[PDB]
Structure 1
């Protein structure tokens, strides 16, 4: 209904550092720097004092002022993700067959795979982006723990490891065998 003016409150903690030209973002925090690209939203930012950031789509429509709360939550995730990052719980399951997901390194490209899934003979394979680095939960068995400083590139590198395991041309509410994701978390302590 042609809202006039809209600002909100993006918090910045003490260690991370946000310096921005036009609307792309540079961010360096305590756990390895980053930079990202957001040139499609037509906002303007204002640091007021060292910890707080404005956004503004004034003379916005109504689908504009839905996309300010989305960039209350598109630049915060890299602010948290440069000082926390994301950590993952992906429990396995066996109905009759085992699963040995283990990181082979073909071509020096570090590709994760899975054998012996529902008695298959195809060697599966997953391309693995940077940011992440696969570790397993040691001796608390059959999970996968995926680190990283990114946000999309960890839970597309997780979401496209829990969907290779689709069983096809069968029931899906009895053939519950697969790979699923239990609980994503942050790698810092208490999380």
Structure 2
């Protein structure tokens, strides 16, 4: 089986062994698509994913490889963006970006700040009770977003009564 991805006009793709690099105006991303007997190459202005194998396991990865590459095209052009909101009930939670990590202070009244380091060239812009995570690498972006929500995770008490935390409000 073989699939051909026509690459967008503002974009450029390049191979280097098992690594692929996609570059658009919104930046660039480099990934690794290493699976047995699956060749990923850049032919002219198209990316080809092919293999002589057609078993369920090989077909699975081909489809995964495709989405990964279409996501890269989208990342370097329209970019990826996740929206978030901070909802607190009693203790005023302070969310801020300090350095390369987001810091949440006074969560549920805690005296110690919780923090998570941002992934890659992902930019986190906070404005009021809203947060917005964006960047070319969806993996890097997706994690950062999730990382922030996970940062206000609570296991000890009943979640139905304690909901203070930063939640993902918009998924691309």
Same fold (TM over 0.5): yes
Q: Could you tell me which residue of structure 2 aligns to residue 182 of structure 1?
A: 169
RMSD value, Cα: 1.9
Q: Could you tell me which residue of structure 1 aligns to residue 111 of structure 2?
A: 121
1:55-85 deviations in Å (ceiling 9; x for gaps):
2122332211111111111111111111122
CA distance in 1, matches of 2:16, 2:143: 28
Specify the structure having the higher radius of gyration (Cα).
Answer: 1
Runs (4+) of structure 1 exceeding 4 A deviation are 46-49
Task: List runs of 5+ in structure 1 lacking aligned partners.
Answer: 1-5, 186-191
> How many residues are aligned here?
172
The answer to whether the 8 Å contact 1:41/1:67 transfers is no
Q: Could you tell me which residue of structure 2 aligns to residue 136 of structure 1?
A: 126
1:47-66 counterparts in 2 under 5 A? 47=42, 50=45, 52-66=46-60
Task: List runs of 5+ in structure 2 lacking aligned partners.
Answer: none
CA distance in 2, matches of 1:115, 1:21: 44
SS at match of 1:147: strand
Q: Choose from 100, 103, 106 the match for 2:97.
A: 103
Deviation at residue 40 of structure 1 after TM alignment: 3.1
CA distance in 2, matches of 1:59, 1:123: 51
- Between structures 1 and 2, the one with greater strand share: 2
Distance 1:97 1:45, change over 3 A: same
Corresponding position: 1:78 with 2:66: no
Give TM-score, length-normalised by structure 2.
Answer: 0.88
CA distance in 2, matches of 1:104, 1:24: 32
Corresponding position: 1:167 with 2:154: yes
SS at match of 1:160: helix
The answer to whether the 8 Å contact 2:134/2:141 transfers is yes
Q: Could you tell me which residue of structure 2 aligns to residue 91 of structure 1?
A: 85
- Between structures 1 and 2, the one with greater helix share: 2
1:6-17 counterparts in 2 under 5 A? 6-17=1-12
Deviation at residue 90 of structure 1 after TM alignment: 0.5
Q: Could you tell me which residue of structure 2 aligns to residue 34 of structure 1?
A: 29
